[PDB]
Every structure is written in C-alpha cells, then in structure tokens.
Amino acid sequence: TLGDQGGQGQEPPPEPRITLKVGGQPVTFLVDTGAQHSVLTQNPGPLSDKSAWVQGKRYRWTTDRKVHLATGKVTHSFLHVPDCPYPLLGRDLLTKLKAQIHFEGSGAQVVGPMGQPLQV
Amino acid sequence: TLGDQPPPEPRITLKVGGQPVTFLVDTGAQHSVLTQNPGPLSDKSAWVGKRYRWTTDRKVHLATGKVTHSFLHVPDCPYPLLGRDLLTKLKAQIHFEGSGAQVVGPMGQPLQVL
Ligand SMILES: [K+]
C-alpha cells in the first residue's frame, strides 16, 4: 500500500504520462523509455532490503505492489527514488505490460498491446 | 554534417547530417541530443543544470521520409537521445515486447532504414 501521493501538481510529469492506481493510490508517471527501472518518488509503502545503484547513488526496491490498470492488474516492485522529480514507468514495466506509446503532435497516448486504455 | 561518430533498447540507428548515429529513443527527454562531433553549432542554446548549444538544422533520414531537425549538443550525456521533439514530429510509436521494443511510424512501419 502506498501512502500520500499528493502534491504532484507542483512538479507534474510531461507527456507521455499515465495515471495508474498503485498500492491503492493514484500515481501519475512519466512513461520513460530512458529508465531501466520504474520509480516511486514518495510514501512508497514498505521497502525490501534490496537496493540498486542509480547513476549517482543507491536506493531501495519496494516490496511487491499491486498496479491497477484500466483493464487488469499486475504486481510490480519499484525503486524508491525521492531525488527524482516524478514517478517513472520505466522499461521493466513497459516490457511486462507490452505497452505501446503513440505520439500524436497533440501529445502522446499510452496503450496496452491491443490498444486498450491503461490509464485509470 | 557530422564528424566522426552503446545505448540500451529502444535503440535506433539513423543517418543524421550524413553520418549514422545510434540513439536511445528517450521519452524522458524533451530535446534530441548529439554527444560527439555534431558539426556547426548555432548561437542559440538551452538550459538542461547546464547550458548547451543547438546545432544548426540537420537532415534526418527515416524509412518514412526525411526531416530537418536541430539537436542539442550535450557531450556530457552518455549517448545520443531521440527525444519527444522528434518523436512528435514523426508521430512515432514505440511498441514493447517482452525483451525489447520496436520504433515504428504512424502507420506501423519501422522507422529505421539501416
Ligand atoms: K498522485
């Protein structure tokens, strides 16, 4: 379960972005193909004892979290990186979801492998 | 034109200014970046915690046609980045499979020619 995910309007991710429910709370992520691992920036719930080097310093992985998508749920663990401006959905989750990112001129859409809305 | 020229997936290799450049396709980047011998630089620049110069315009060769684009010259970046500016110009789509990804045009065709 996550704690407070509020205050994102102070540093909103740019598009492509997607809001998902993670551990019971809505989180708006930048969908970031440049990130190997997905990241929560605040109140991430309990942390495992495992950590990763982020190039740079070391941060802990969360335990498994439920990730609510428009039409299904997945389990995923995130790095807790407070020194990041916003939550990132990185390649680990993109590959797991077989997500597609579509650019439009007017911004970007993030959909599932069948074009389904992912965003809650 | 570029002078003498590894990113993780999603990677794409494009001819830019006459030279092949392998880019990370980076939705986290506002601006596209060249890191090495980027050819003539403009007098315009962007803050990124640092200020870097834009290149003058460069022909970018895609399977979908050619486009003109200026890149930020950022040597202190580990690899060239194809950022949201170009992805939007191209109406590109990035499709993930389990172990990788494909970068494709507005109608499903691969963008890379090489
Ligand atoms: K939020």
From Swiss-Prot, chain B:
What residue stretches are annotated with the Peptidase A2 domain? 21-86
Catalysed transformations (reactions):
Endonucleolytic cleavage to 5'-phosphomonoester
* Domain of life of the native organism: Viruses
Question: Which sites are catalytic?
Answer: 26
Q: How does it assemble?
A: Homodimer. The protease is a homodimer, whose active site consists of two apposed aspartic acid residues. The reverse transcriptase is a monomer.
Q: What's this chain's function?
A: The aspartyl protease mediates proteolytic cleavages of Gag and Gag-Pol polyproteins during or shortly after the release of the virion from the plasma membrane. Cleavages take place as an ordered, step-wise cascade to yield mature proteins. This process is called maturation. Displays maximal activity during the budding process just prior to particle release from the cell.
Name of protein: Protease p14
Gene encoding it? gag-pol
Report where the shown chain sits in the full-length sequence: first residue, last residue, total length: 533 to 657 of 1733
